[PDB]
Symmetry: D2
Subunit: 188 residues, 4 copies
């Protein structure tokens, strides 16, 4: 038995710095404005933690987890079978390659672009359904800069939320995670 959202980060097969951590994952899910029956793309899925929890939010939605890295693909395989996330389909693809075969998306999360950010945004803009939402998480200045630029260029309203989290595990010292910029884009 796992919670609907808020699965502990340690339960995912992952690498250091790869996982969308629990708290930011929850905010990311929230920004995606999910409802049942939608199609969602998770570009650069990593460990697929965002996909897995989104699948719990949309039991009859369809989630397409895209990842090109062989090590990460192994993580995802192990996770999808641990968490019984049957409405998630793993797709081996270097986005924007592999998107043409996917059904039109209501929701797109961009966890990793692999140097292809502008190309992914353009490809997604052409495919995104009416009332669609794009969410990206960014930890670097260049990705933050360029994502805001490219989304605004396509006429998206854009919100940027910078989320800082510090936690005590005794002696309770607050340890900070690095900041995550959750960028949310839609048509008004």
């Amino acid at each position: 038995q796992y919670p609907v959202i808020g699965i502990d980060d340690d339960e995912f097969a992952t690498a250091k710095k790869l996982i969308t951590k629990q708290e930011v994952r929850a905010v990311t899910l929230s920004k995606l404005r999910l409802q049942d029956d939608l199609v969602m793309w998770d570009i650069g899925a990593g460990s697929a933690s965002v996909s897995i929890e989104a699948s719990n939010l949309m039991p009859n939605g369809r989630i397409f987890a895209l990842e090109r890295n062989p090590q990460y693909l192994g993580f995802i395989r192990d996770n999808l079978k641990k968490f019984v996330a049957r409405n998630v389909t793993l797709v081996e693809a270097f986005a924007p390659e592999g998107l043409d075969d996917l059904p039109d998306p209501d929701r797109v999360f961009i966890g990793g672009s692999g140097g292809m950010l502008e190309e992914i945004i353009d490809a997604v803009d052409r495919r995104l359904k009416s009332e669609g939402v794009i969410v990206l998480n960014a930890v670097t200045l260049d990705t933050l800069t360029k994502a805001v630029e490219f989304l605004e260029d396509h006429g998206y309203m854009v919100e940027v939320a910078c989320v800082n989290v510090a936690k005590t595990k005794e002696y309770k010292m607050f340890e900070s995670h690095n900041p995550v910029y959750i960028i949310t884009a839609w048509k008004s």
Copy 2:
């Protein structure tokens, strides 16, 4: 409306009362919700936590306790608007009014009304096996005493300080505006 992430301005609320959207999502995460559970929301305010919790537990039962008459009207209006039928609004000044409720799997404490120790004691007696208590604190006194009382009762306690800054406007002047920090306190028994 989405399952979670309903815009703050869609709720009938007062200034400084609502559990704002980002922090709400983290709070629900920390609550470790699954369907069919019983949840108490003590000091419900606008009941935004109760309402999104109810979306995550369609077959669960949520009990939202609120003492303030102005906030009761907000709740009534919100429950109807968002169709949160599995939330029962309970008019009470907790720990009063907890007795008629079923034992909780999950308790969120959003407001104590000067009754923090008494609420934690009452909740601790009732809390089911593998239960989780979450509290959102914005003052240092609440943060200090909540950690102190929960640790007295043998709970494992995590504190997560969540700082959110967001842009708005439309373009050009995309300035980050900070929310005030919120301390999300999660307590559970390491035993169970």
Copy 3:
């Protein structure tokens, strides 16, 4: 009767949202790598709180505070008199106009651009002394973006520090932390 740095925000003649607030002001001064005998420009001075505290840190240094808003020039004239900042010269100008007549700077603080950010950065770059340091404070994404771009274009090493401050007033424990908006302090220098 006033400290070297950490002068209360209230003691400056100022407008709402104008002042570089105390904590951020302190970090800004720290990033400015101040030592005595230097020339500093403070572009878009506001109330000149940055110029004033820098003046305490460099008593034998020379500071030029540029501002053209007539109201703010009043604030600066008041504040320079109140705090006895004699080594600060008020310059009535909207940068990059009014920079030509100034001595070559070792340090430049850009507190306000008036939409002339690129032109200000270009002007400053041509003039900045060896081992010089530029500091800017950005609150918008657009300023953050363009500043980093324009400074990297001119070949500077650029550090961005995002500073978040949340404070209790006065009851302290019975009293919510109130957050200031984040400030991006951008520090630029040649390696």
Copy 4:
């Protein structure tokens, strides 16, 4: 070396010990320093706060208390490196060793070493009129207790939680890396 804002890597220090430069600047700011004052730095660590405070008060008098042998090593190395002649290193564990110091105008508590309550009480009996106490706290326990004990003694307390995240100098991959939060607690009568 600058008057304030000396790069953290220039001090002899250990992991997690130094008052990092941004927070150090805010701390000096909160200390309300002016020349000719007497300051105590209790649990001085690497003495980075005392050193930069020395620059702010050349004719002031700073007493840096430390008795961890490794940290005393760092301090001696640092004072020699930065020319901070108005800093006296005092080998002691507060509140003992405070009786040998002159009455302070300013007190920074950087490390209490389990003696927080006793330190605040001893400081309170000695602090000069218009004096300022500053403490940097990173645990909830220290935050809680400092605030309680300072208000117990009739101080007006400000707590400023400072979060700093920063990139590096290189253009390639500018990721914001967070320092842990620091609660800078300022107290005055």
